[PDB]
Design a protein around this ligand. Structure first.
Ligand SMILES: Nc1ncnc2c1ncn2[C@@H]1O[C@H](COP(=O)(O)OP(=O)(O)OP(=O)(O)O)[C@@H](O)[C@H]1O
Ligand SMILES: Nc1ncnc2c1ncn2[C@@H]1O[C@H](COP(=O)(O)OP(=O)(O)O)[C@@H](O)[C@H]1O
Ligand SMILES: [Mg+2]
Ligand SMILES: [Mg+2]
Lengths: 39, 35, 487, 466, 67
């Protein structure tokens, strides 16, 4: 049971990492806004 | 090089020390009973 | 499960960005990075490479900073960004490291999760001065008859285990660690000894074997194992002894008592030599850097016994040194011998002649000596030491052989101090000259069995009082006389 | 990415890149060569220049010659298709049997297995060699190292082990020849073809060969051991097999690094060796291991320069091994073969709880009597044999009988000795040495125990002398 | 807040695992079977899904009677 949990969780991490990479000027807008708040 | 056999600590220095200790413990037992 | 990875694993992640002070890798090679910039970096400060790797800045030079990489330099390229962390190298410390196998920087390598440690401590702290210390009085029990009797170790002492390869040094350290279980489960808090094993430059399967042996005897619950193995970067093997010493200084500074084994310091010297030669520092004797003595002395001075005003805690150190062909006169062996409070010399000839552990009682000295023994052990062991010396002078002779074959001991079997006292009593009072040297060993076993089956009262008496009384002297006298009659 | 050569010194080549500086350990191909000249990046020098170690000869290189970056380290073909084939350091076939058509290629530079992958099983591996099985027994999945000077019998012993273990082995086997004789590799190839362990006609081959020999430049000699490791690691991980890995000679690895260490611009360490000797050796050796994904039993022949065991290379190798068989030239000049030093060879399973109290007691008693003989040797040399006691003479006689009985005729040595080889079971070894230690043969001459198998052959030879 | 995008979107994607056992794996069995083989063979050899039946033995004894 523990091994199944571990391997399933590891593949979940791998899949989420691979699949968020596949998924905007709002990014640069917020980046410039935060660099404005750099003080 | 005087005393270099005992100083080298080989198989000959150990037997030299054993001989001296044997002889002089025998002599000490012989000298203590006569005291 | 989609809850252990998203409840707080992503919800709390410190996503904020900071204005970092950085430099730029001018060159990288053999685990040395020459870095441009980093104007305000401190000496021995921990910096971080753009690939998650960490390094330590050791060479502050006018035009560059020499950074030693705590990992593989394969991931660093010329032009990479090196950020400051603003802190001098430090490691987590605390009670939460007990039972865990960690690397040289404190990351758990045992696959059991993060160490819930809240306290951090620098690895290069200064040892306590003259005032915070007090004389070494409490005994550090190894469970080894030859050690506990002829080369006794106190709490706060530095005793060196020096010898050739495969002479039994790690066996002495592991016996000492296994022995502390009798005290670490008892009720006396000032008698518990938390152990720390630093593996430096060892094979990783050797450390796995050692952790298995420590878990079999249930010794891992009070042991921290710091592991900087042969595949780890030379900075990590350089830094492992100091990380372990910080983990032990935590206990030393809190009224608790700790024991640390550096296995071994020769490989730390080798790793430091590699780092220094690659940092282009000029070599000295045997290519070692000029300050290898400082390397080991600033480490072995941090083992100390504290006075009452500072908690009364202690840190005992058992450094290990491997000599080549018995050359005690080599550079690093003589350095560490001049540092420590005594040595336990192991020999290959003694090992193969049947003397196990192969301790050379002629050379093995404990500069603390009887000051750190129990009174009963001192009573039996002064006479045993005198008779063993007299036997070595002529090697009476039958009593000497009896004591020699009585000093032999099995592996992973650390005896209690009361049983040690009973055995040395039986051997030093004449109850063993009626037996041939060959059978002595088995008698001992039987003897111990008997004594631990129907005579727990006398052993508890010896344990509580610390000394033997003339009453208990006569008691054990008649017990051993009856057993020899029945044997 | 394309760079150009700016300096050539021996096996070291500086390459200057205008764009796309290749990472360290990447493989680069030199353009304009007749054969494949691979450079492995070792250092980033700055100013967009890298320093590389060449895997072949650098003769004919011109400053300004073009060099392409592959984008990855040296990748060799891994799989069951490499069984029965010979490949060089860069994975190219050198047996004239065409391409090795695997479905996967693995880089020769990989990370060592983690701490949580280590295994702890320590079952014995009986070899049929009396001294090895008695005094320093090997373990399955463990690391064996055969130390020895020039011409003491490291290759003979490793070939005897290939004969006694690899044929009787159920899994696969990999032989990495590192900086050794090329004719020895030819001999091994053709002997494995004769004995059916390599099959040139179908896919029943059980051994993969990887050879970079002593005619190779130092880069090939430094990386061919890694190539063999990669083959064995594939067999251990992706196949789950039990692998046998023979490396003769591993010392060459270290030596090859030494030969380039000066050209890489590093301050020399003790005896002129690279300052990175121990960490290079560790990075290489930690991959030679049994994990909980598969087993690798490793036999490594370790050359001892000028017979000096304190030399940094063998002294550093000593810590990476589970069993060490130390061959001695002094024992080899006494005619005793194999020349194993019985008081210098150790094993970690020489433990009563692992080999049995009987085995442990026989081994420890043999070593005790040999140590006592060695202690007496000085007096025996000067004051002659007659100045000893009776028990001392008995110890000398029994120790000499045991010295003789530790020798053994090998089947690989049948050709130049005539004596048929002997494979002695472990129980027969323990029994024979128990009997000699007891005194049951104090009446036989010591020449009766020389070069026999079991103790019954010793008594037969005794009855044949008289 | 692309980190929160990761969080939310991939939570809702992984939760879509009714019709699938291991959250859209399409792999990870070829090695899992070897791992389970090793794990079972190092825990035992019999069937570890049923109660163990217990064979028991009785100590031997000799003719101790006075001869
Ligand atoms: N007291 C003992 N009695 C019997 N055998 C012992 C004893 N001590 C050690 N040994 C055995 O002798 C061998 C020495 O190994 P050990 O690890 O203890 O020493 P070492 O100096 O650390 O060796 P190395 O550093 O080269 O690995 C071991 O196989 C061990 O089992
Ligand atoms: N087991 C042996 N029996 C008899 N002679 C041997 C044996 N091993 C080595 N020799 C002798 O030593 C010589 C060198 O053998 P070899 O193993 O190739 O040396 P090296 O140690 O360099 O590998 C052999 O040709 C042989 O004469
Ligand atoms: Mg050790
Ligand atoms: Mg050879």
């Amino acid at each position: 049971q523990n091994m199944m949990r571990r391997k399933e969780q590891e593949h979940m991490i791998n899949w989420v990492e691979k699949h968020v990479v596949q998924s905007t000027i709002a990014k640069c807008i917020a980046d410039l806004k935060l660099l404005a708040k750099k003080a | 090089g005087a005393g270099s056999i005992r100083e080298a600590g080989g198989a000959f220095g150990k037997r030299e020390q054993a001989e001296e200790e044997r002889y002089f413990r025998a002599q000490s037992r012989e000298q203590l009973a006569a005291l | 499960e989609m809850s252990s990875i998203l409840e707080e694993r992503i919800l709390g992640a410190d996503t904020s960005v900071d204005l970092e002070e950085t430099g730029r890798v001018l060159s990288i090679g053999d685990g040395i990075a020459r870095v441009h910039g980093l104007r305000n970096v401190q000496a021995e400060e921990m910096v971080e490479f753009s690939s998650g790797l960490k390094g330590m800045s050791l060479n502050l030079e006018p035009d560059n900073v020499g950074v030693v990489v705590f990992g593989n330099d394969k991931l660093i390229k010329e032009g990479d960004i090196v950020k400051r962390t603003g802190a001098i190298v430090d490691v987590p410390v605390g009670e939460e490291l007990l039972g865990r196998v960690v690397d040289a920087l404190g990351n758990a390598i045992d696959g059991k999760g993060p160490i819930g440690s809240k306290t951090r401590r620098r690895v290069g702290l200064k040892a306590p001065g003259i005032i915070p210390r007090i004389s070494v009085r409490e005994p550090m029990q190894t469970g080894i008859k030859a050690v506990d009797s002829l080369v006794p170790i106190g709490r706060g002492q530095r005793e060196l285990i020096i010898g050739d390869r495969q002479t039994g040094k790690t066996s002495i350290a592991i016996d000492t660690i296994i022995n502390q279980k009798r005290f670490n489960d008892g009720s006396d808090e000032k008698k518990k000894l938390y152990c720390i094993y630093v593996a430096i430059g060892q094979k990783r399967s050797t450390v796995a074997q050692l952790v298995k042996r420590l878990t079999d005897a249930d010794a891992m619950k009070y042991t921290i194992v710091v592991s900087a193995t042969a595949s780890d970067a030379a900075p990590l093997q350089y830094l492992a002894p100091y990380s372990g010493c910080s983990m032990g200084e935590y206990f030393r500074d809190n009224g608790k008592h700790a024991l640390i084994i550096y296995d071994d310091l020769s490989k730390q010297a080798v790793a430091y030599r590699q780092m220094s030669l690659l940092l282009r520092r000029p070599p000295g004797r045997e290519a070692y850097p000029g300050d290898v003595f400082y390397l080991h002395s600033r480490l072995l001075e941090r083992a100390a016994k504290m006075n009452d005003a500072f908690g009364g805690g202690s840190l005992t150190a058992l450094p290990v040194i491997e000599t080549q062909a018995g050359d005690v006169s080599a550079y690093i062996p003589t350095n560490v011998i001049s540092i420590t409070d005594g040595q336990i010399f192991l020999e290959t000839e003694l090992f193969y002649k049947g003397i196990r552990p192969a301790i050379n009682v002629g050379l093995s000295v404990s500069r603390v000596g009887s000051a750190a023994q129990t009174r009963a052990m001192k009573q039996v062991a002064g006479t045993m030491k005198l008779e063993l010396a007299q036997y070595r002078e002529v090697a009476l002779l039958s009593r000497g052989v009896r004591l020699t074959e009585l000093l032999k001991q099995g592996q992973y079997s650390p005896m209690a101090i009361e049983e040690q006292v009973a055995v040395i009593y039986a051997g030093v009072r004449g109850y063993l000259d009626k037996l041939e040297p060959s059978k002595i060993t088995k008698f001992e076993n039987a003897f111990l069995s008997h004594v631990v089956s129907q005579h727990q009262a006398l052993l508890g008496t010896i344990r509580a009082d610390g000394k033997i009384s003339e009453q208990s002297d006569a008691k054990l006298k008649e017990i051993v006389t009856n057993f020899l009659a029945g044997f | 990415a394309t760079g150009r050569i700016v300096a050539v010194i021996g096996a070291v080549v500086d390459v200057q890149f205008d764009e796309g500086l290749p990472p360290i350990l990447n493989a680069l191909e030199v353009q304009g060569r007749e054969t494949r000249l691979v450079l492995e990046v070792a250092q980033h020098l700055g100013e967009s220049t890298v320093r590389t170690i060449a895997m072949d000869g650098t003769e004919g290189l011109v400053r300004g010659q073009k060099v392409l970056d592959s984008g990855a380290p040296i990748k060799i073909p891994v799989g069951p298709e490499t069984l029965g084939r010979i490949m060089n350091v860069i994975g190219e076939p050198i047996d004239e049997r065409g391409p090795i058509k695997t479905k996967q290629f693995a880089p020769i530079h990989a990370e060592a297995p983690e701490f949580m992958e280590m295994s702890v099983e320590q079952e014995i591996l009986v070899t049929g060699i009396k001294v090895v099985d008695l005094l320093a027994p090997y373990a399955k999945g463990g690391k064996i190292g055969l130390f020895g000077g020039a011409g003491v019998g490291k290759t003979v012993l490793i070939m005897e082990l290939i004969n006694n273990v690899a044929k009787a082995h159920g899994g696969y086997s990999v032989f990495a020849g590192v900086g050794e004789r090329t004719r020895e590799g030819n001999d091994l190839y053709h002997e494995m073809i004769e004995s059916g362990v390599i099959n040139l006609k179908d896919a029943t081959s059980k051994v993969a060969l990887v050879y970079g020999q002593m005619n190779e430049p130092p880069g090939a000699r430094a990386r061919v051991a890694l190539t063999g490791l990669t083959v064995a690691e594939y067999f251990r991980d992706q196949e789950g097999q039990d692998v046998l890995l023979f490396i003769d000679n591993i010392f060459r690895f270290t030596q090859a690094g030494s030969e380039v260490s000066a050209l890489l611009g590093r301050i020399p360490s003790a005896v002129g060796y690279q300052p990175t000797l121990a960490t290079d050796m560790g990075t290489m050796q930690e991959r030679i291991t049994t994990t909980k994904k598969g087993s690798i039993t490793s036999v490594q022949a370790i050359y001892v320069p000028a017979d000096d065991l304190t030399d940094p290379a063998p002294a550093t190798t000593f810590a990476h091994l589970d069993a060490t068989t130390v061959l001695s030239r002094a024992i080899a000049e006494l005619g005793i073969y194999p020349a194993v030093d019985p008081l210098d060879s150790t094993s970690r399973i020489m433990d009563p709880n692992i080999v049995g109290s009987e085995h442990y007691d026989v081994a420890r008693g043999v070593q005790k009597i040999l140590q006592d003989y060695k202690s007496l040797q000085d007096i025996i040399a000067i004051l002659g044999m007659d100045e000893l006691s009776e028990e001392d003479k008995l110890t000398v006689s029994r120790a000499r009988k045991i010295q003789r009985f530790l020798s053994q005729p090998f089947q690989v040595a049948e050709v130049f000795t005539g004596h048929m080889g002997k494979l002695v079971p472990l129980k027969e070894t323990i029994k024979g040495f128990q009997q000699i230690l007891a005194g049951e043969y104090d009446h036989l001459p010591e020449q009766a125990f020389y070069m026999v198998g079991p103790i019954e052959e010793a008594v037969a030879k005794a009855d044949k002398l008289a | 807040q692309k980190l929160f995008v990761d969080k939310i979107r991939e939570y809702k994607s992984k939760r879509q695992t009714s019709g699938g056992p291991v959250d859209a794996s399409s792999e990870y069995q070829q090695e899992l079977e070897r791992e389970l083989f090793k794990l079972k063979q190092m825990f035992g050899n019999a069937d570890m899904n049923t109660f163990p039946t217990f064979k028991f033995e009785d100590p031997k004894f000799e003719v101790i009677e006075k001869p």
